[PDB]
Amino acid sequence: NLSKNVSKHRLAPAMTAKRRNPNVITNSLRKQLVISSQGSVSSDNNTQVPLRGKFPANERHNVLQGSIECDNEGVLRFYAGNGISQALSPSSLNTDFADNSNWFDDICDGRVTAVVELKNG
Amino acid sequence: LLGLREFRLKQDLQGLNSPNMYQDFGHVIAVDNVTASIDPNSDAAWLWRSTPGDLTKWMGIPWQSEAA
Amino acid sequence: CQYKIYPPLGIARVGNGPAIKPLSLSTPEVPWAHLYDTNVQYLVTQQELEQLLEEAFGGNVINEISQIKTKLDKFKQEEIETITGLLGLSHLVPQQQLSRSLDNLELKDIVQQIKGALLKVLSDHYLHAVKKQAQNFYIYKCDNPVEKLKLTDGDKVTWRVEVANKKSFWYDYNNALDLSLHTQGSGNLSKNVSKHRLAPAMTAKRRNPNVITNSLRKQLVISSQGSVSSDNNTQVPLRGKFPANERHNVLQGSIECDNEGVLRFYAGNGISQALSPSSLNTDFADNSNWFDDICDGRVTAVVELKNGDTFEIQDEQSSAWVATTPPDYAPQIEPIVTMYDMVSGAALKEQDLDNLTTQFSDVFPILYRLYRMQWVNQADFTDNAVNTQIRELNSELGFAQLLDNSASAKSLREGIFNQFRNPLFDQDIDVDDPGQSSNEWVSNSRIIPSKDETNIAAKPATSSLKLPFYPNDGIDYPGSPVQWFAIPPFMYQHLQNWAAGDFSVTQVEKESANTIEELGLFYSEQFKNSPNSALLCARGALDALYGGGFHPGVELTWPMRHNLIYSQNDYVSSVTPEINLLGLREFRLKQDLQGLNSPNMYQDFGHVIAVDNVTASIDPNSDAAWLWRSTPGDLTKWMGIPWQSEAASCQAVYTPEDFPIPSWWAANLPVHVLPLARYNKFKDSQSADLPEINGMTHSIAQGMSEETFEHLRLEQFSQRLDWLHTADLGFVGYHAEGGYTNGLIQMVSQWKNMAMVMARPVENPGSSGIPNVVYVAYSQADKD
Amino acid sequence: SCQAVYTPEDFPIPSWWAANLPVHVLPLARYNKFKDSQSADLPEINGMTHSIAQGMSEETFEHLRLEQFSQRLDWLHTADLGFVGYHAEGGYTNGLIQMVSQWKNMAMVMARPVENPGSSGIPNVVYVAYSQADKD
Amino acid sequence: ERHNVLQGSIECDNEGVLRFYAGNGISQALSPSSLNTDFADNSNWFDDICDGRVTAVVELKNG
Ligand SMILES: [Mg+2]
């Protein structure tokens, strides 16, 4: 994927990078900057389950990160969010291509597990 | 046609409850932290063992600014 | 080692005043010589221009126009030509401006008509101009300096100067790269900064990044050179071009030698410009397409005696350097930590600071300088508990208690010492996530937020904000203890010894210490009578320059706080046999002896510079070691381009709490000043013999009770004005935007109009509470 | 937009409607540094330790009072209107934008007593601007 | 201060035809910091556009 010439001949040096939302200090309080959610579905019941979190994590907005469904045959279906991005104040504009403080979006990623329970036991 | 492969991500089995769920490298991130991350016994190796949020945290916030 | 040049690092400041002795200033050669001098004139005065004009009417001139008045009875190109010249005015003002001011005169005594037309042209150019601060350089005979060179008939000295500007060729200033450099710790910088990752050095990209290949980037460098001898006192310009050889002439300085062999170096006129008018300097340090007339370079000499002995002053042991800088807008207000203090700390190891011995004269400069910050910074006038305690002590003539090293004064010394920030940066912190890669020292005092706000509640501070209330090299990292300025390790060590009672002081000092001003005047006398004029000259050139914080600073920046940049840096003596006053040193820059011809004149590190390049530079056989072997332009290339952007960015940094207001470098770029308008409303006593008294009619001023009169004086003395408002920096007019960026843009033209702080007398303060010497900011906007 | 309109001449600063939208005010922080007299029995007097406040001459104590009384603060600086933080732009337009949320945090001016002004020249009734940013 | 503005150039040939050239298209502000952000009304700016009055006198050999 990547030739060793780039590093060795310094063709595009990696830059340092500061924190986003840098005014929130200590790791304990920066946990508020993380939106997270979880859910479970099974083949017995196809009711859809929303993966809803909060920002800042527990003012405060509900963030629909996704929705999960399971059907009669055991296939999980994962719907992403509605594409809602917002800032904690309307006057905070997202003028940078990548690093805008006070903002959140409903993008997510995470871990998919399962348990198989057979008739006999 | 370029082939078919069997691949799986390195995962933190504790997920949302991993003690590395909220790790960082202090005031800045730099290539030195990635170089240290290479050694699987070092305290920066967690960068490759994904907890929820680790694939997309790099990207632009909000994604619309980056799309535009 | 037969002859040396002093000072080893000369300083000259830009100004739009002319490059002639009577209308310029001189870099200090003796520290603290003129702190209370109420006759200083740092701007060109009407009086000075009148006297210049008079002296140009000698001696022929009044006769040769009376002649031409008869030879007359308009002028004639030829007629005016012989007037102009006869006047020695060609060098101050363009030929055609003098001519066309007479070509349109109304002839039909006629001297006075000519005088008035010529005074107006000088006044248009130079009235209220920021005077140039020039550097005199001296050759001393050695055995080790004692005695200036004295020339006899047949003797000659020839000076050579070569300077450059490389700001536009160098890298972005994001922060000080040594913040991540591994170290044992110096007197200037604790090893805790790098060790505990308190303010990590950033990578920095190139300025003007669209100019590629080294050979084309050479166009980005402005350089010039010249020589003068005690055999020609004609001034010589140091004139370059940008881009280097469309194309602008850049005056980087002017040099002259007198018949005694003394070199005088003037800086440029403070002209900054872009190659295109639409390129605005909206960033504090890194503006592409811009050039300024700042410079620095190599100063050498050759002595040639009558018999035919020739002595070359060219090795780094004997040569000198010169650097030009922004003006000093408060020359009598000294930075709390100076560039000389950086020289002093650079040769000390942090580990051995507990072997330092401390006199009270090593501690007094901290308290004295902080005290005098009240004239340029609101926080130190009304929000500094230490300055207020000093005022309490002065009010009881009990300042000398601070010089008491006994156990009964220890509580008093510790209460003061305990309010100062510790440059270990390990107080008022909580350790976050110990043992993790998240490990971090997080301040539990007041932070300085980033402009990129987050609407989450701030963590309440539990520790008090320590002194001084100035930002520092780690400004970029909210919660870092390095966001705020600490006096450097060796100066904090003196203060710690002071608090402990482990300091000495003479009885003669105690007897002059009933107030801080009385003691300051005493120490100033000790500098004046000190015999080592060569080492005082070395120190005086640097004691007015800032020694932190370095983001990037004002005149020079962080490479100066490392012993790496000097070829010599040795303690020599105390100022007085019995009084140290922070000491006298022999220091010299490491120089590339090939100057502008060095193969490393145009060296860099590729697409970025980073701390790894500095780490590599420690090895003197490295391909990075050139970073410390200075070629012309190397000292000033780190600073902002143009400098006026950096100066307009060098003011207040507002926190969500109103008070105290943090200020960057207020001693040389003031933030809150006392304007002339207010001076004229408290300077008079109720018995002053004037028809208007402190802005009131004579009748009203004497109709009020004496109590109310003195109160009005104090109220006016207490009205301090934002220095940025002493000229039009984009906030003037209906619906004017104002703001940070407009100040940056307007400072390119308005720097020459900002208020200049000068000591001025208050003849009869009475019971007003106003001191006999006040420091008054003069500008055209603030004068009424 | 209802604040100062600056002229090339610094003084006097023109102001639009300052009786209802103040331009320069006396903040609570300054009131807490001139309201006490020297004989007060408190660990902290006018922002000074008891020891320092009583150790100085009466004349100087009253002078410090009057200097604090004379410190007037730009009213726009009594909340965060866009000028707070490293490299914050500040300026007129950010003021307009931020006032939508920050109007409720701007300083409110209220009459307050000075029980014993002594001979400092401070009146018995002073009008003090209360906001969270200017309180200390 | 004060800028020279070339508003035009004129020449006449031996048969009496006037040729009028406009300026070089140079526009400028008195300070480089004054930007022309408005489509029509920018203060501190000047350009070298012009318009004016054209007259002549014919002198024949007889007089
Ligand atoms: Mg100064």
The DSSP 8-state label assigned to residue C624 in this structure reads S
Give exposure, B10-40, as e/b (b: 16+ Cβ within 10 Å). Answer: ebbeebeebebbbbbbbbbbbebbeeebeee
Q: Which residues contact C622 (CB under 8 A, 6 or more apart)?
A: C616
* Chain C contact set for D64 (CB, 8 A): 388, 391
Number of H helices, E strands in chain C: 22, 26
For chain D, how big is the Rg over CA atoms in Å? 17
Residues C508, D80: Cα–Cα separation, whole Å = 52
Burial of B56 (0-12, 13-18, 19+ CB in 10 A): middle
Residues C81, C71: Cα–Cα separation, whole Å = 15
Residues C293, C65: Cα–Cα separation, whole Å = 41
Alpha carbon of residue C86 to chain centroid: 38
Residues C14, C325: Cα–Cα separation, whole Å = 6
By CA distance, what is D95's nearest residue in A?
Answer: A91
C385 labeled binding residue: no
Residues E46, B14: Cα–Cα separation, whole Å = 70
Provide the shortest C-alpha distance from residue C486 to chain B (in Å).
20
In chain A, DSSP assigns E strands to 17-18, 49-55, 61-70, 76-80, 85-87, 103-105
Contact B22 A27 (CB under 8 A): yes
- Is the Cβ of A91 closer than 8 Å to some Cβ of chain D? yes
Residues C362, C367: Cα–Cα separation, whole Å = 10
In terms of DSSP bridges, do strands C773-778 and C608-609 run parallel, antiparallel, or are they unpaired? unpaired
Assign A66 to helix, strand or coil. strand
- Is the Cβ of C272 closer than 8 Å to some Cβ of chain E? no
Structure tokens given for C391: 């005022």
**Given its phi and psi angles, is residue D133 left (phi above 0), alpha (psi -120 to 50 degrees) or beta?**
alpha
Closest CA to C244 of C270, C211, C267, C269: C211
Neighbours of C636 (CB within 10 A): 26
Residues C495, C360: Cα–Cα separation, whole Å = 9
- Is the Cβ of B40 closer than 8 Å to some Cβ of chain C? no
Q: Which residues contact C560 (CB under 8 A, 6 or more apart)?
A: C339, C342, C343, C346, C635
Question: How was this model experimentally determined?
Answer: X-ray
Neighbours of A60 (CB within 10 A): 11
Provide the shortest C-alpha distance from residue B8 to chain C (in Å).
26
Q: A and C: touch, per 3+ CB pairs < 8 A?
A: yes
Residues B46, C340: Cα–Cα separation, whole Å = 47
* Chain D contact set for A91 (CB, 8 A): 97-98, 100-101
Provide the shortest C-alpha distance from residue C447 to chain B (in Å).
14
How far is the CA of C78 from the CAs of C84, C86, C152, in angstroms? Answer: 10, 13, 44
Beta bridge partners of C411: none
The tally of CA atoms less than 13 A away on the side-chain side of residue C470 is 30
Is the peptide bond preceding residue C559 cis, with omega within 30 degrees of 0? no
In C524-641, DSSP assigns E strands to 566-573, 584-589, 608-609
Contact C411, C395 (CB under 8 A): no
Q: C and D: touch, per 3+ CB pairs < 8 A?
A: yes
Residues C237, C504: Cα–Cα separation, whole Å = 51
Structure tokens given for D44: 């902290």
Number of H helices, E strands in chain E: 0, 4
Contact C440 B26 (CB under 8 A): yes
The rounded Å distance from CA C332 to ligand 1 centre is 6
Contact C313, C319 (CB under 8 A): yes
Is the peptide bond preceding residue C59 cis, with omega within 30 degrees of 0? yes
In terms of DSSP bridges, do strands C608-609 and C584-589 run parallel, antiparallel, or are they unpaired? unpaired
The rounded Å distance from CA B6 to ligand 1 centre is 70
How far is the CA of E56 from the CAs of C18, E19, E52, E53, in angstroms? Answer: 52, 13, 14, 10
Residues C713, C731: Cα–Cα separation, whole Å = 29
Closest CA to A41 of A82, A72, A85: A72
How far is the CA of C501 from the CAs of C149, C407, C496, C508, in angstroms? Answer: 45, 7, 9, 19
Contact A103, A92 (CB under 8 A): yes
**Alpha helices (H) along chain B:** 31-37, 63-67
* Chain A contact set for B18 (CB, 8 A): none
Helix or strand holding residue C364 (H, E): helix C360-372
Give exposure, C275-310, as e/b (b: 16+ Cβ within 10 Å). Answer: eeeeebbebbbbbbbbbbbbbbbbbbbbbbeeeeee
- Is the Cβ of C281 closer than 8 Å to some Cβ of chain E? no
Contact C639, C557 (CB under 8 A): yes
Residues C649, C671: Cα–Cα separation, whole Å = 11
Residues C226, C239: Cα–Cα separation, whole Å = 9
Closest CA to D83 of C288, C731, C486: C731
Closest CA to C715 of D14, D129, D71: D71
Assign C597 to helix, strand or coil. helix
Given the structure tokens 């590729």, which residue do they identify? C606
- Is the Cβ of D57 closer than 8 Å to some Cβ of chain C? yes
Contact C17, C26 (CB under 8 A): no
C26-29 long-range contacts, Cβ below 8 Å, gap at least 24? C26/C133, C26/C134, C26/C135, C26/C136, C27/C133, C27/C134, C27/C135, C27/C136, C27/C540, C27/C541, C27/C544, C28/C540, C28/C541, C28/C543, C28/C544, C29/C136, C29/C533, C29/C536, C29/C537, C29/C540, C29/C541
Residues E45, E57: Cα–Cα separation, whole Å = 37
Contact C624, C617 (CB under 8 A): yes
What is the sign, positive or negative, of the torsion defined by CA atoms of C510, C513, C518, C519? Answer: positive
Residue C638 phi/psi, 5-degree rounding, is -70, -25
By CA distance, what is C476's nearest residue in B?
Answer: B27
Given the structure tokens 């209308």, which residue do they identify? C23
Neighbours of D83 (CB within 10 A): 21
In chain B, DSSP assigns E strands to 28-29
C245 labeled binding residue: no
By CA distance, what is A100's nearest residue in B?
Answer: B61
Contact E30, E42 (CB under 8 A): no
Assign D32 to helix, strand or coil. coil
- Tell me, letter by letter, the H, E, C secondary structure of C496-523: HHHHHCCCECCHHHHHCCCCHHHHHHHH
Test mutation, A34, A65, A107, chain B, max B CBs within 10 A: A107
C258 labeled binding residue: no
By CA distance, what is A110's nearest residue in B?
Answer: B52
Helix or strand holding residue C64 (H, E): helix C61-72
How far is the CA of C196 from the CAs of B44, C98, C258, C416, in angstroms? Answer: 16, 65, 54, 28
Provide DSSP, C635-660.
TTTTS-BSHHHHHHTSSB-B-SS-SS
The DSSP 8-state label assigned to residue C542 in this structure reads T
In terms of DSSP bridges, do strands C320-325 and C9-13 run parallel, antiparallel, or are they unpaired? parallel
Helix or strand holding residue C773 (H, E): strand C773-778
Residues C57, C64: Cα–Cα separation, whole Å = 11
The DSSP 8-state label assigned to residue C262 in this structure reads -
How far is the CA of C712 from the CAs of C451, C694, C715, C783, in angstroms? Answer: 39, 9, 5, 19
Closest CA to C317 of C587, C35, C16: C587
Residues D68, D27: Cα–Cα separation, whole Å = 10
Residue C431 phi/psi, 5-degree rounding, is -80, 115
Closest CA to C207 of C195, C220, C194: C220
**Alpha helices (H) along C87-153:** 95-103, 110-126
Contact B66 A111 (CB under 8 A): no
- Tell me, letter by letter, the H, E, C secondary structure of C435-497: CCCCCEEEECCCCCCECCCCCCCCCCCCCCCCECCCECCCCCCCCCHHHECCCCHHHHHHHHH
Structure tokens given for D28: 């609570």
Residues C693, C695: Cα–Cα separation, whole Å = 5
Structure tokens given for C74: 């308009």
Identity of residue C525? E
Number of H helices, E strands in chain D: 4, 6
The tally of CA atoms less than 13 A away on the side-chain side of residue A64 is 13
Residues C130, C331: Cα–Cα separation, whole Å = 12
Given the structure tokens 């009270």, which residue do they identify? C360
By CA distance, what is D2's nearest residue in C?
Answer: C735
The DSSP 8-state label assigned to residue C166 in this structure reads -
Residue C16 phi/psi, 5-degree rounding, is -90, 0
Structure tokens given for C133: 């601060």
Beta bridge partners of A69: A77
Residue C65 phi/psi, 5-degree rounding, is -100, -30
How far is the CA of E7 from the CAs of E26, E31, E50, E52, in angstroms? Answer: 10, 21, 6, 11
Contact C582, C365 (CB under 8 A): yes
* Chain C contact set for E29 (CB, 8 A): 277
Test mutation, C125, C290, C291, C745, chain E, max E CBs within 10 A: C745
Structure tokens given for A38: 């979880």
Residues C186, C192: Cα–Cα separation, whole Å = 11
Contact C26, C40 (CB under 8 A): no
In C76-232, DSSP assigns E strands to 133-141, 156-165, 204-205, 222-229
Interface list for C 376-435 with B (CB within 8 A): 435
Closest CA to D69 of C590, C639, C718, E6: C718
Residues C429, C440: Cα–Cα separation, whole Å = 9
By CA distance, what is B13's nearest residue in A?
Answer: A111
Helix or strand holding residue C758 (H, E): strand C756-761
How far is the CA of C148 from the CAs of C5, C469, C569, in angstroms? Answer: 10, 43, 22
Contact C590, C559 (CB under 8 A): no
Residues C475, D87: Cα–Cα separation, whole Å = 10
In terms of DSSP bridges, do strands C133-141 and C25-26 run parallel, antiparallel, or are they unpaired? parallel
In terms of DSSP bridges, do strands D44-45 and C756-761 run parallel, antiparallel, or are they unpaired? unpaired
Distance between start and end Cα atoms, chain B:
34
In C186-338, DSSP assigns E strands to 204-205, 222-229, 236-242, 248-257, 263-266, 273-274, 290-291, 296-304, 310-313, 320-325
Closest CA to C14 of C330, C222, C325, C329: C325
Contact C453 A27 (CB under 8 A): no
- Measured in residues, chain B has a length of 68
Residues C588, C660: Cα–Cα separation, whole Å = 39
Nearest CB among A27, A97, A104 relative to B60 is that of A97
Assign C80 to helix, strand or coil. helix
Identity of residue A67? S
Interface list for C 723-752 with E (CB within 8 A): 745-746, 748-749
Contact D73 C284 (CB under 8 A): no
Assign C543 to helix, strand or coil. coil
Beta bridge partners of C313: C301
Contact A98 B62 (CB under 8 A): no
Assign C133 to helix, strand or coil. strand
Nearest CB among D7, D70, D83 relative to C654 is that of D83
Known binding residues of D for Mg(2+) are 19-20
Assign A115 to helix, strand or coil. coil
Contact C501, C406 (CB under 8 A): yes
Closest CA to C505 of C354, C355, C362: C362
Give exposure, C736-760, as e/b (b: 16+ Cβ within 10 Å). Answer: bebbbbbbbbbbbbbbbbbbbbbbb
Beta bridge partners of A62: A54
Closest CA to C270 of C754, C777, C748, C779: C748
How far is the CA of B55 from the CAs of B11, B59, B60, in angstroms? Answer: 11, 8, 12
Provide the shortest C-alpha distance from residue C270 to chain A (in Å).
34
